[PDB]
Amino acid sequence: KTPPVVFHWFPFIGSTISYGIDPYKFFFDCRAKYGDIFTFILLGKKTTVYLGTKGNDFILNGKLRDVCAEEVYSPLTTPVFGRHVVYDCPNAKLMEQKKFVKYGLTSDALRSYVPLITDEVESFVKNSPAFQGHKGVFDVCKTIAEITIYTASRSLQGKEVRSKFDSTFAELYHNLDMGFAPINFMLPWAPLPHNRKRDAAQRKLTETYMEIIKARRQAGSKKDSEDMVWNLMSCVYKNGTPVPDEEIAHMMIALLMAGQHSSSSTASWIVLRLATRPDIMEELYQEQIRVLGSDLPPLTYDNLQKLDLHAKVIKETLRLHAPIHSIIRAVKNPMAVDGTSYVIPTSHNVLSSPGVTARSEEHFPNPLEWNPHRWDENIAASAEDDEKVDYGYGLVSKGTNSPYLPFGAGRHRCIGEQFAYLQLGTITAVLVRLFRFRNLPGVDGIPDTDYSSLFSKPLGRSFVEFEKRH
């Protein structure tokens, strides 16, 4: 049987439609019939799925030779981010690029970001049409996407980029973002207009970033703390070569896209969940009074860390809504399941879904319930029991006895996690100070999840009520 093949009704299209609408149900159904191993092919390819912590570990801590990350994602991502970065290079190069970024994301940089982020959010609320007036409704995703783009560009991308978003960067991003179109799952190369727009934006962004850098050199200065003034200096690879401006530009673009899509989606889910749960939001608010005090002094890198429930709300949301549902590798050499008869072959993709474990009864009783309090068992912005293996950058716990891996594990694990927590936690705390949220009358629960795009996000246009506090 090799790995059980998934009984479907058509060639090529296979089960993909089933996948596309909802993978998790799809995976679960598959699980029920076939257990922890499946095979369905989506589009062209045979994607082999290993569920379970072991399923997770196998693929995520899979051997460098045996599974390849870039061959799967490079075409799609590479046109977008640019050449030579992320997946446009051998793994070793990737590891050094992660190193530079993680280098640029130390606590003292993180500290520097918090005031900037609180400033952008507070400025947005004051100056934006979104929250004008005491009581109102607003478009969550649109509103939240703007906030995350402002907060990340000010802190991480820096002043010039932030300034640009006022002019010309908004459209560029939107155009570039078309590179993540579902047809681009198959046809990234083809010169459809949207692809031609994508290529046009990518070039233009690169020219801009490069001019920003060159201008900095021209004055040969520094001032705080963006990954930019950081990649200028964290120039050098082991070979002794400093990172070229173009690479810096393409790295920034990658970080921009990555952070924005992940942040905006997650942040959206947080606002949506909170709207459903006025009790939690008040508790969050009550936490700030209790822990920071009645005065509600300004949020800092230090005092944020006390927001245990805020931390929990993010964790709980990540558990159910994290935008990445499927992690995929290209099988380079046939691989032996430690357990079983099945052998996984080269014509195959391997797909792991930590979200599944994430929403399993064994691992999480009543998993589908969005309850932050379930975490009263533990909290880690940084986690847990397993071994730490250093690949390049730092010392990453590939640890995989954890059912909960929103940020992945092994050599491909997120280096943006701390930043993401900082950003989300900060945005959440501010909003909680400023607002109450309710559902529109007669509206219960939350919209559905749209898995059609590479990242997943709330489906429709969802409005929710906002009430201000003073």
Ligand X SMILES: C[C@@H](c1ncncc1F)[C@](O)(Cn1cncn1)c1ccc(F)cc1F
330 binds, among ligand HEM, ligand X, none (CB under 5 to 8 A by kind): none
Distance (Å) of CA 339 to CA 27, 323, 402, 467: 20, 30, 19, 55
- Residues 323-362 within binding reach of ligand HEM (CB under 6 A): 323-324, 327
235 in a labelled binding site: no
In the numeric block, the tokens 């529109």 are attached to 440
454 binds, among ligand HEM, ligand X, none (CB under 5 to 8 A by kind): ligand X
Q: Name the burial class of residue 8, with classes exposed (0-12), middle (13-18) and buried (19+) by CB atoms within 10 angstroms of its CB.
A: middle
Which one of 40-48, 184-192, 317-325, 395-403 is the stretch in contact with ligand HEM (CB under 6 A)? 317-325
248: left (phi over 0), alpha (psi -120 to 50) or beta: alpha
406 binds, among ligand X, ligand HEM, none (CB under 5 to 8 A by kind): ligand HEM
With CB under 6 A as the contact rule, the residue among 147, 414, 429, 464 that binds ligand HEM is: 414
Nearest to 254 by CA among 325, 191, 180, 165: 180
Per rule CB under 6 A, is residue 421 in the interface with ligand X?
Answer: no
> How far is residue 387's CA from residue 409's CA, in Å, rounded to a whole number?
11
- Residues 287-346 within binding reach of ligand X (CB under 6 A): 324, 326-327
266 binds, among ligand HEM, ligand X, none (CB under 5 to 8 A by kind): ligand HEM
With CB under 6 A as the contact rule, the residue among 109, 252, 258, 429 that binds ligand X is: 258
CB of 230 closer than 8 Å to CB of 103: yes
- DSSP type of residue 373: G
Distance (Å) of CA 163 to CA 150, 166, 169, 204, 249: 9, 6, 9, 16, 16
With CB under 6 A as the contact rule, the residue among 131, 407, 455, 466 that binds ligand HEM is: 407
Per rule CB under 6 A, is residue 101 in the interface with ligand X?
Answer: no
The least distance separating ligand X from the CB of residue 76, rounded to whole angstroms, comes to 8
Looking at the Cβ atoms of 168 and 452, the one nearer to ligand X is 452
Phi, then psi, of 24 in degrees rounded to 5? -60, -50
- Tell me if residue 350 falls in helix, strand or coil: strand
Per rule CB under 6 A, is residue 152 in the interface with ligand X?
Answer: no
Q: Which residues bind ligand HEM (CB under 6 A)?
A: 69, 94, 98, 255, 258-259, 262, 266, 322-324, 327, 406-408, 412-416, 419-420
